[PDB]
């Protein structure tokens, strides 16, 4: 997250760190959202590589013991069947991970609430991105979980020629694009939380930014729109 602020440690208890085994240690690669005690939602592109993955819930500082972490292996990966790794702009950038064990819920570990199917945010709706991704273009991962305020940019604007043009689809949400705050590598797969009728819900799964950099004016961060995939998610969980 570029241009973020450190999150309070109990603000975003559905945020997870997806990590891969790197020698004798583990490394953060992506974010995710806990959606059942044994299921995580993330981006498909985060699981393209044939790595050994684990999920960490209750994480705040990747480089210190917080006293709240639960570590759980990933047992099964279900990527959206239309996902095509060499065409992120086509969409379908979403995957579900079934955890080896069910995690225990507490003030640091909670299920993400999802929007009702079909819900679209009005232009300029208040949202936060969260994650441990790079804090500058071509920088380094954050230590502590970051948040940044990114108002939504509706489809009519986001799909206009000076923004993303045809690359953005109605199955996506765009947010930010102010040139200061954005998602960045390592934030992929994590949540866009938007305040609707008094309650934060996870409306986006972080999908992509510009190749010209993370915080680029008129290139808002692009998220998979969770509300387009409610039936898919329920179908997967009910059949696994
Ligand atoms: Na930690």
From Swiss-Prot:
It comes from Sus scrofa (Pig). One of its GO terms (biological process) is proteolysis. Gene3D superfamilies: Trypsin-like serine proteases (2.40.10.10). This is Chymotrypsin-like elastase family member 1. It comes from the Eukaryota. It is found in: Secreted. Serine proteases that hydrolyze many proteins in addition to elastin. PANTHER family: CHYMOTRYPSIN-LIKE ELASTASE FAMILY MEMBER, CHYMOTRYPSIN-LIKE ELASTASE FAMILY MEMBER 1. Disulfide bonds join 30-46, 127-194, 158-174, 184-214. Its cofactor is Ca(2+). The gene is CELA1. It catalyses: Hydrolysis of proteins, including elastin. Preferential cleavage: Ala-|-Xaa. Residues 1-238 form the Peptidase S1 domain. One of its GO terms (molecular function) is serine-type endopeptidase activity. Binds 1 Ca(2+) ion per subunit. Keywords: Calcium, Disulfide bond, Hydrolase, Metal-binding, Protease, Secreted, Serine protease, Signal, Zymogen. Belongs to the peptidase S1 family. Elastase subfamily. Its EC number is 3.4.21.36. SMART domains: Tryp_SPc.
């Amino acid at each position: 997250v570029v241009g973020g602020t450190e999150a309070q440690r109990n603000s975003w208890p559905s945020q997870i760190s997806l990590q891969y085994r790197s020698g004798s240690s583990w490394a953060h690669t992506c974010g995710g959202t806990l959606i059942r005690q044994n299921w995580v939602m993330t981006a498909a592109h985060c699981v393209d590589r044939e790595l050994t993955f684990r999920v960490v819930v209750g994480e705040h500082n990747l480089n210190q013991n917080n006293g709240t972490e639960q570590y759980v292996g990933v047992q099964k990966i279900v990527v959206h069947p239309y996902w095509n790794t060499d065409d992120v702009a086509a969409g379908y950038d979403i995957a579900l991970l079934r955890l080896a064990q069910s995690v225990t819920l507490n003030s640091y570990v909670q299920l993400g609430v999802l929007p009702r199917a079909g819900t679209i945010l009005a232009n300029n709706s208040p949202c936060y991105i969260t994650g441990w991704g790079l804090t500058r273009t071509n920088g380094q991962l954050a230590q502590t979980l970051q948040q940044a305020y990114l108002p939504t940019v509706d489809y009519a604007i986001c799909s206009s020629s000076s923004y993303w043009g045809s690359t953005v689809k109605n199955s996506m949400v765009c947010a930010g694009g102010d040139g200061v705050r954005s998602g960045c590598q390592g934030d992929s797969g994590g949540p866009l939380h938007c305040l609707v009728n008094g309650q934060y819900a996870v409306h986006g799964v972080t999908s992509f930014v510009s190749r010209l950099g993370c915080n680029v004016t008129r290139k808002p961060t692009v998220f998979t729109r969770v509300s387009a995939y409610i039936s898919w998610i329920n179908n997967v969980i009910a059949s696994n």
